[PDB]
Design a protein around this ligand. Structure first.
Ligand SMILES: [Mg+2]
Ligand SMILES: [Mg+2]
Ligand SMILES: [Mg+2]
Ligand SMILES: [Mg+2]
Ligand SMILES: [Mg+2]
Ligand SMILES: [Mg+2]
Ligand SMILES: [Mg+2]
Ligand SMILES: [Mg+2]
Ligand SMILES: [Zn+2]
Ligand SMILES: [Zn+2]
Lengths: 150, 83, 160, 102, 70, 24, 98, 91
RNA sequence: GUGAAAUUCUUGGACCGGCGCAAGACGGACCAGAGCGAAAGCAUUUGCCAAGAAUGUUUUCAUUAAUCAAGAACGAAAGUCGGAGGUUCGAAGACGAUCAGAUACCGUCGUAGUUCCGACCAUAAACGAUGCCGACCGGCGAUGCGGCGGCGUUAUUCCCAUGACCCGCCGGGCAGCUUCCGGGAAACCAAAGUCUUUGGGUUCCGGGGGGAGUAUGGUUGCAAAGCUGAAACUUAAAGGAAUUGACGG
């Protein structure tokens, strides 16, 4: 079930049982890793990297071909973004909702959605504080939201 | 059907079944060797591609993103890879 | 007309009278009540569009078009419902091909082309690719303003 | 006792249905709850057709009809006998009554 | 029929109208008799059209939400 | 009594009680 | 669709290319010839608008009339002050065409 | 701290004149003494000089406005109505 | 106008038929045991603004989760305050009827209100009288959305798409029919089942009927009232589901 919606969607991605690298994939581990460096320097999030590599370079799983995940590869070089991507997009959405909400006062639906989005922000932030991704004094403030994101 | 054979189902119904609900999770997608006309190289394309794929050199759009399956442009061949 | 349909009606406002005869020009068209009501059936979607169009003659007219979805001969489903986006595409399609057929020509060409309602016929044909429409006509037309009532322009349409 | 699993109205996935007015007593009834009539009646009597056909200037004059959509609260529907209370078993079926065409 | 005959009218286009508005749309019992008597009195009938006021959406109907109790 | 009207009668009693308390 | 594009592209001009903010600095880069695109808020004084336009006519540089004001041209530039006039030395984002 | 609970600016009137009259004049006095942003220079320096007169301290621009607010909702709809009538006047 | 009348409007043309103008409401028919939203609720066309379910996914993070005292957001209608506007309808009220009486049911007029903006209020039979998350346990025919396939027809064109149909499949929904799955006091329910063969996790909440959602205290509100919430006292039943009979303006 959805965290903040009454839906029970099963739309997922079924990873194949085959853990072996495909034999028709002639790209090697360094070939994929330099591609990760090139696209990250272009400005693509790790979610955007995996979809592009799979679609265009025909790689099954980056973990399968390189032995490590995309985010682990990005941080080992050190060019990975300081904010986690999902937390970044949640805050970025909250800024768009807040900007639209101040323009339209009577959008009670949007004000309802803002609480839902911000609740996901504060719950995800608590998880990252446990894993020390964020500083212990980090905080999502509505006033500073438009600055920290984008 | 009290005597349904849950261990050994013939693959016709397994292909009919949802990917998650199969006996073993098998994806419903693949990678296809797409061969656009007017060129000489084979470009690997995910069968459910969400992006407009392009070659390193070809200035020709190979597929377009739709709901479930990548929509190949007309005239381009495609070959399966190891099923 | 001689052997046309009976459900169409026309206003024919008088504009100039001489001798013992009154001379009338077009003022508006309206489909009759029982034909309009009979066209509205369940398990189908209607599309109503309006557009303000100006003839080359200086006449301002409100063109209303009504189009009903058509169930197929082999159709088994009770309902034939067009999706909202399809309805929007049909409405926009039959708005621009309704304002084109009036803006291009004069009042005379519009009037005798809606006498058999050729506009609704091409509206139906252009929409066959999206959703088959069959019960398509021109619901109504009314005149918002008139350009000064030139005597010569009335006499020519009443004569040669 | 819950008389009908239908709850006497067609509201299943909705939360609120806009009301209509009873065509007889002008009572606010929900649209999906009021009994709906759609009567396609001849504009003339069943015995006046022959008289009009003599005075019709058109020899092949088609006869126009009347299109009236009636809405009734169950008070006016029962009072006018357009619907009737049925037995416990006979309540469940939803088929319309036969047209008596032949 | 008598007044039209003595004024020089021989045919009619009957335009029926019920109460209309948010009120009743069914014409009363006088519709059938008056229409029938016009043709039987020696007068011609042409096109018959309905001009009953049929609103898109009217104002509030008189009577209250509980109706006219009887 | 119909429960709605019993509720209304209780309301008019409560308004009377509040007036007499505020008076003192 | 032009206003939503110029807001995102002006964001890309920052932290990718070299710019300059303010009217006095803008004139210096225009008369030095290295200004390429000059963006003016609609809040600009009318004398300043025609003066910058005349300078850009001599310098053969384009002038975009921003559909904001000097308050939200500052927000568009990503700054916390009001900018009434700015010039772009090099885009770095192809908001101008070579 | 928050020095008053609900009176706000009309605490200067004490207990006088009635609660509803102080409440009615509270929103007017807040807007009449507020500093509006100038639409000519962008600085929040546009403040009331006299009744109906608003003045920006920075760009020295004086504008004619409402008695208490910088512009009344009446005149805002009027300016929009005149613009539509102007574009209707020509074609 | 009514069962019948009457108060009422009318030779100054009342009603009616035609042509205009103005105002304020409301979006019929299409409109469905159809859709969406957390609920309340949402239906003329187009444009803009953000939002969301489901689907598809060999994309990504890697336990980040379920329910939740305290706390908070939204919340039909009616009601309150201030400002607009007030067509229709219409509490209060008046008059005519009806009646033994008729402060009503019927009719004519009619104030607040009914519409918009801002600020309150927080209650409904706010109902599916049925907590949420998860799993398992019959069948069948449909429907909405998305997707995957397939004879063929149709729209264009010369062919695929691409729409519209026809036959299936998958998932997520609103439902529907049937069943000795099982349960239940039964009505009935595929959930109200998997409950003496009693334990998946977790909120709220009832203890015979009244007194009573009353008194008091606290708290919220401009007010109306809202939240929390007793006791003394009284009583042998009050109720639920079905059966038979009686009775029904
Ligand atoms: Mg009962
Ligand atoms: Mg409800
Ligand atoms: Mg009765
Ligand atoms: Mg309200
Ligand atoms: Mg008021
Ligand atoms: Mg009245
Ligand atoms: Mg639990
Ligand atoms: Mg008790
Ligand atoms: Zn009724
Ligand atoms: Zn200023």
């Amino acid at each position: 079930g959805r965290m903040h919606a009454p839906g029970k969607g099963l739309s997922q991605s079924a990873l194949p049982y085959r853990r072996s690298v495909p034999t028709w994939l002639k790209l090697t581990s360094d070939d994929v890793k330099e591609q990760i460096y090139k696209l990250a320097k272009k400005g693509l999030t790790p979610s955007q990297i995996g979809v592009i590599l799979r679609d265009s370079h025909g790689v099954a799983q980056v973990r399968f071909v390189t032995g490590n995940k995309i985010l682990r590869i990005l941080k080992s070089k050190g060019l990975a973004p300081d904010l986690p991507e999902d937390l970044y997009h949640l805050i970025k959405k909250a800024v768009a909702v807040r900007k639209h909400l101040e323009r339209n006062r009577k959008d009670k639906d949007a004000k309802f959605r803002l609480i839902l989005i911000e609740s996901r922000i504060h719950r995800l932030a608590r998880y990252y504080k446990t894993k020390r991704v964020l500083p212990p004094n980090w905080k999502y403030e509505s006033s500073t939201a438009s600055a920290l994101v984008a | 059907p009290l005597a349904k054979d849950l261990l050994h189902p013939s693959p016709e119904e397994e292909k009919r079944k949802h990917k998650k609900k199969r006996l073993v999770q098998s994806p419903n997608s693949y990678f296809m060797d797409v061969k656009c006309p007017g060129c000489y190289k084979i470009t690997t394309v995910f069968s459910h591609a969400q992006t407009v794929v392009l070659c390193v050199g070809c200035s020709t759009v190979l597929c377009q993103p739709t709901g479930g399956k990548a929509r190949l442009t007309e005239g381009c061949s495609f070959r399966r890879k190891q099923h | 007309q001689n052997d046309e349909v009976a459900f169409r009606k026309f206003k024919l406002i008088t504009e100039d009278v001489q001798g013992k005869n009154c001379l009338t020009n077009f003022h508006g068209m309206d489909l009759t009540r029982d034909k309009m009501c009979s066209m509205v059936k369940k398990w189908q979607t209607m599309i109503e569009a309006h557009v303000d169009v100006k003839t080359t003659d200086g006449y301002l007219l409100r063109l209303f078009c009504v189009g009903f979805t058509k169930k197929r001969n082999n159709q088994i489903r009770k309902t034939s419902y067009a999706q909202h986006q399809q309805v929007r595409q049909i409405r926009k399609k039959m708005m621009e091909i309704m304002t084109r057929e009036v803006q291009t020509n004069d009042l005379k060409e519009v009037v005798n082309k809606l006498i058999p309602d050729s506009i609704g016929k091409d509206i139906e044909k252009a929409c066959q690719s999206i959703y088959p429409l069959h019960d398509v006509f021109v619901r109504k037309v009314k005149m918002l303003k008139k350009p000064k009532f030139e005597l010569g322009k009335l006499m020519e349409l009443h004569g040669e | 006792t819950k008389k009908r699993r239908n709850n006497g109205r067609a509201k299943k996935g909705r939360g609120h249905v806009q009301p209509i007015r009873c065509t007889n007593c002008a009572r606010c009834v929900p649209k999906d709850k009021a009994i709906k009539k759609f009567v396609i009646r001849n504009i003339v009597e069943a015995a006046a057709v022959r008289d009009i056909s003599e005075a019709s200037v058109f020899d092949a004059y088609v006869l126009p009809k009347l299109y009236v959509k009636l809405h009734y609260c169950v008070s006016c529907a029962i009072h006018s006998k357009v619907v009737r209370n049925r037995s416990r078993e006979a309540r469940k079926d939803r088929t319309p009554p036969p047209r008596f065409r032949p | 029929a008598q007044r039209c005959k003595e004024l020089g009218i021989t045919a009619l286009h009957i335009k029926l109208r019920a109460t209309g508005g948010n009120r009743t749309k069914t014409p009363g019992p006088g519709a059938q008799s008056a229409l029938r008597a016009l043709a039987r009195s020696g007068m011609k009938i042409g096109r018959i059209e309905d001009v009953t006021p049929i609103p898109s959406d009217s104002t509030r109907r008189k009577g209250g939400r509980r109706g006219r109790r009887l | 009594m119909r429960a709605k009207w019993r509720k209304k009668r209780m309301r008019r009693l409560k308004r009377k009680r509040r007036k007499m308390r505020q008076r003192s | 669709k032009s206003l939503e594009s110029i807001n995102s592209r002006l964001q890309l001009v920052m932290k990718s290319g070299k710019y300059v903010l303010g009217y006095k600095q803008t004139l210096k880069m225009i008369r030095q010839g290295k200004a390429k695109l000059v963006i003016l808020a609609n809040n600009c004084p009318a004398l300043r608008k025609s003066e910058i336009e005349y300078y850009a006519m001599l310098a053969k540089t384009g002038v975009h009339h921003y559909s904001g004001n000097n308050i939200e041209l500052g927000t568009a530039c990503g700054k916390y002050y009001r900018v009434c006039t700015l010039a772009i030395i090099d885009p770095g984002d192809s908001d101008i065409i070579r | 701290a928050k020095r008053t609970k609900k009176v706000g600016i009309v605490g200067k009137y004490g207990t006088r004149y009635g609660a509803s009259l102080r409440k009615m004049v509270k929103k007017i006095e807040i807007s009449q003494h507020a500093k509006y942003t100038c639409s000519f220079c962008g600085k929040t320096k546009m403040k009331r000089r006299a009744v109906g007169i608003w003045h920006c301290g920075s760009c020295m621009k004086t504008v004619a406005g409402g008695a208490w607010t910088y512009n009344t909702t009446s005149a805002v709809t009027v300016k929009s109505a005149i613009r539509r009538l102007k574009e209707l006047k020509d074609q």
